[PDB]
């Protein structure tokens with residue numbers, strides 16, 4: 001059964017929402033209240049909404065986000081809003097945030113706009129969305145491809161931006177479309193690591209999967225390849241019995257750079273189920289990345305461009321026969 | 327000195343933000359992190375940003391808002407996102423939220439869209455933005471008019487919506503442009519109040535101003551017209567010595583409707599510095615609204631259309647010589 005959405009930003013609008021809901025007693029409503037404000041009156045009507053809707057959510061907004069008024073403003077009110085406004089010469093944002101925060105961008109038409117990579121999604125070129133795995137209408141992959149094509153077109157054409165920073169050296173970017181300056185921005189510093197010959201031990205680390213059905217495969221991989229440590233994925237909710245979990249406030253990239261400087265003679269091996277962090281770390285000194293492709297998973301668990309990016313990057317892809325591990 | 331804005335939604339993007347900031351040591355940055363997630367890693371890098379930026383803000387987002395991925399998603403990840411997605415048959419929102427949440431609307435291209443009034447701002451017709459008080463370039467009023475013209479054009483033309491609900495009976499709406507059905511939605515029920523002849527006392531209530539420079543004028547008005555009570559504005563931070571403040575979880579409209587039913591013989595008088603709530607309450611039984619126009623304020627404290635709306639609505643405008651009150 002489909003749902004109806006209601007979006008409100010004042011109390012009277014919530015009263016209007018209630019009237020609409022009551023005229024449609026047979027329909028499902030999710031109601032979102034957005035406000036910069038907090039008080040007893042807002043709570044009373046929001047609680048009524050909570051009681052009456054299938055789902056209700058209060059979405060707090062930073063004070064001063066809205067430059068408009070639901071009421072007719074006085075001169076005093078116009079003046080306050082006009083000088084709270086920071087004067088904005090430039091805005092930097094992820095390339096796909098040109099889609100998601102386009103309405104805010106449009107309120108600063110004279111600002112210079114520059115983008116940076118969203119992440120490894122920038123590495124899938126336009127043409128890849130046109131084959132054969134994205135080709136069957138109705139499918140989840142087709143719908144994905146259609147969404148991405150539409151998003152990149154918006155990012156590349158609206159709210160013109162004149163430079164794009166990429167953190168990926170030597171892989172073509174979806175934003176490299178000749179309408180902006182491409183600038184490589186090395187995120188990580190490797191000079192001054194002072195890394196030497198690998199005459200010390202070997203330290204093996206598995207990059208944990210945020211996907212809970214990968215738990216047994218992960219444990220099997222650790223046993224099979226003798227991997228002592230796991231770097232848990234930020235969005236991972238489980239542990240790997242018989243593997244030591246690394247606990248650190250750093251992202252894996254910074255953690256490894258810190259370890260290299262501390263242990264300039266240690267061989268570091270990073271094993272991964274095609275994690276995007278691999279693509280940033282392949283060029284670190286004394287670091288050796290291996291992608292694991294478990295035989296029990298379908299060929300299409302990963303999108304085809306993933307296999308190609310890993311190979312273009314010089315990262316070995318290892319068949320892992322996980323059913324041969326107890 | 328103008329500022330630069332940075333918008334981030336991942337940790338690696340915050341690292342990119344830091345690099346950009348460090349290359350511009352002489353410039354001012356405000357950085358916004360938007361995330362659905364919370365953890366120690368996000369905090370570490372956000373705290374670095376806090377340390378390095380002039381201003382930094384974490385803007386929490388509801389889980390599942392973003393249908394895209396900064397990384398290349400697996401089949402499992404595509405599946406999870408595809409079925410968290412509520413199927414949406416219709417979206418109701420304030421007319422100007424068609425501008426502010428346009429990017430979200432665009433992700434539901436087959437949903438039926440209906441709007442309702444933002445508030446009294448709907449009562450200023452297109453033509454009013456074209457005269458003479460909005461006419462001098464560079465001014466705050468010109469910039470306001472330009473913004474509103476642009477916003478209403480977007481609301482009226484993009485993401486077509488087929489009906490608009492107004493709570494204002496007998497005042498023309500900016501959205502009544504022949505491209506949608508106008509529907510009057512009476513917010514308040516007045517039958518069943520069972521209000522009778524005004525044979526009881528008179529209760530006078532001043533609607534408080536959210537503007538702190540109105541404190542003395544408000545106190546003067548209360549003394550001058552013998553107003554016993556003030557209904558504080560939701561966004562009002564001060565009190566009126568010698569006036570009883572009403573304390574209620576209801577908006578003034580509901581509060582008065584409750585009082586009328588309880589006291590069907592009482593004359594209620596509402597005094598206001600052109601508050602928009604007056605426009606909803608003029609038609610309540612046993613309620614008499616008076617707008618107060620203090621002589622000490624400039625003629626242009628209120629926008630010209632305000633005076634006209636109050637008169638079209640049958641609301642007396644009373645000159646208040648506030649300098650004649652001690």
Ligand SMILES: CC(C)(C)CC(C)(C)c1ccc(OCCOCCOCCOCCOCCOCCOCCOCCOCCO)cc1
Nearest residue numbers: 009034062063064065068101102103104358422423425426
């Ligand atoms: C405190 C501050 C705002 C000065 C700090 C500043 C400038 C750094 C800042 C912090 C955080 C920011 O977040 C970016 C976007 O966040 C998404 C919020 O969805 C908005 C929902 O609105 C509902 C209320 O609609 C009222 C009607 O409006 C109509 C006019 O709208 C014009 C479009 O502007 C709306 C902003 O668009 C939001 C998303 O792009 C943006 C800017």
Ligand SMILES: CC(C)(C)CC(C)(C)c1ccc(OCCOCCOCCOCCOCCOCCOCCOCCOCCO)cc1
Nearest residue numbers: 032096097099100335360388389390391394427428429430
């Ligand atoms: C839990 C739930 C989401 C399922 C509930 C649901 C559906 C009722 C709901 C609750 C609350 C809602 O708020 C509406 C808008 O709020 C403003 C948030 O500014 C967004 C900032 O994004 C930064 C991350 O960009 C990542 C890149 O993306 C690119 C693709 O974007 C396509 C455009 O979609 C973005 C949504 O646009 C937001 C404002 O319109 C909307 C919907």
